[PDB]
Design a protein around this nucleic acid. Structure first.
Length: 94
RNA sequence: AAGCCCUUGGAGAGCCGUAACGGUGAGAAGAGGGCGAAGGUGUGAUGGGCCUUCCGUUAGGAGGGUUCUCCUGAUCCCUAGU
């Protein structure tokens, strides 16, 4: 997973944070979403509800928002990642 | 006003902020808003009560003024922190 995520952020277009990627999910404008396991429960089952209405891949990350933020290189936590453009990586088949 | 809420917005190797601790992608600053102390300002009140002058000096009667610019201040009151 980390191999594709390295390539995804190098060339693709990405959205960090719950609020911005939650609105795009309701209108069906994200290719895919990855969720860390430490996200708040009220927001996690909102992701799962709106995902069944549009057939968008959902990936459940094992770690927390801190080692998900560190993978992106961003100095603080990111709990939800919205994939709006794959770029050239091969992540969207998961 | 503090505090807590609501839309928008989208930040980092940084920004915002306190008397201090601090806050932030689980969404900061910036823009607008909602609920919101003690008190204050009007009305209550050409009502009083306060200072004062003159006459008759019995009973009383007839007038005048009650404005303006600042400072300090609780161990009383309400409001948030830690």
């Amino acid at each position: 997973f980390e191999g594709e995520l390295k390539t995804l952020l190098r060339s693709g277009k990405v959205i960090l944070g719950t609020r911005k990627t939650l609105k795009l999910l309701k209108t069906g404008k994200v290719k895919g979403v990855v969720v860390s396991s430490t996200l708040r429960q009220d927001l996690k089952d909102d992701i799962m509800t709106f995902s069944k209405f549009s057939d968008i891949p959902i990936y459940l990350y094992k770690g927390s928002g801190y080692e998900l933020g560190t993978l992106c290189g961003k100095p603080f936590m990111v709990s939800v990642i919205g994939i709006v453009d794959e770029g050239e990586s091969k992540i969207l088949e998961f």
